[PDB]
Symmetry: D2
Subunit: 90 residues, 4 copies
């Protein structure tokens, strides 16, 4: 069916990519990848990404992770328990 | 002191959670790619609407008034709740797509 | 096959938005970045409105006046920060435009 | 210090030109609200990448190297061009909706 791999956990990805990496420089880099990610959708239409050519799907996973990696970074530097902070909202 | 994230939820855990709260709030339908995308973009917006006034030569995020750091967490979450939501919808295994990256 | 008004103009807008701001001493906050994050914060409200639509659907002309009135706001707050950004960047936003089309 | 903008083209003018441009390479089909939003949401990113690595009270844009200062224009140019086409595609009076907000 569909499923995410049991790891790397949010804690791994935090440990793994970790001056640049200060607060608002990281927030501008998050918005950037959201900018690349948003680009792989602009000239589409309502119909999904599960059926895109390979070089596209491949970029769809690439840019998507990038965003995570920075959101990861940004929060791990704002000292927010990204993982827990999620369930609390639930 | 070392600041580390807790163990779980796993991204897979973060999925199976949002995955259900809506399936009870009957959402998944409007949950179409761009719909999910465009949302992530409003939260990202809501995320920057805290740093747009703060200068990086300021008390930094850690040292943010409770209610600010509170909002900050409630925001960093949603940006994650939708990133993982968009991924799953694309059939992307966000967790593994990260490894393929490390393969630099 | 539509039309904007002849005014205001971008300097006319770039002008008042000066007067306006630093009339709330809102000019001390026009440092490139703070400004860039502000655009992103408003570039995000604008999305929050289209996260529920689809382009196969009738543009905001059919939207209920209330939804169609809040769309004029964001579209306007987005141009305002964009202008406040360009200016602090000493960019002739108006020329930078046309002098970018004598190309692609 | 305090900068100005040439008296034209006006917001409407830009509107037409882009049209001619986009009416040339059959790009109107490409201009559906959400397209120009994401289209714009993304140029704001390219525009975000520029400053991501820069700094608070460091050199500063206007003192940036040429090729960067030039890329900067590009990026600001684009953001408008899309703001202008979405605004237009939504049948929204962009210049006037800016005063009405004062
Ligand atoms: N509208 C539509 N629908 C389309 C397809 C295209 N345009 C024009 C207007 C806009 O200014 C230009 C995009 O130019 P670009 O593709 O070179 O900018 P960018 O992609 O960011 O440069 P790069 O080569 O991708 O790095 O297309 C419409 O108005
Ligand atoms: C907070 C603020 C506001 N400004 C002025 C300029 C914008 O054209 C107008 C819109 O402000 P905004 O706070 O974004 O209006 P709202 O969107 O309704 O605010 P929120 O609902 O809280 O997002 O405010 C401004 O110049 N600088 C500044 N630091």
């Amino acid at each position: 069916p569909f499923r995410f791999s049991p790891e790397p956990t949010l804690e791994d990805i935090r440990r793994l990519h970790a001056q640049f990496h200060q607060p608002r420089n990281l927030l501008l880099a998050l918005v950037g990848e959201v900018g690349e990610l948003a680009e792989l959708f602009q000239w589409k239409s309502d119909t999904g990404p599960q059926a895109w050519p390979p070089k596209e799907r491949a970029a769809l996973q690439e840019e998507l992770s990038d965003v995570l990696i920075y959101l990861v970074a940004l929060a791990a530097r704002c000292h927010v328990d990204l993982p827990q902070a999620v369930i609390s909202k639930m």
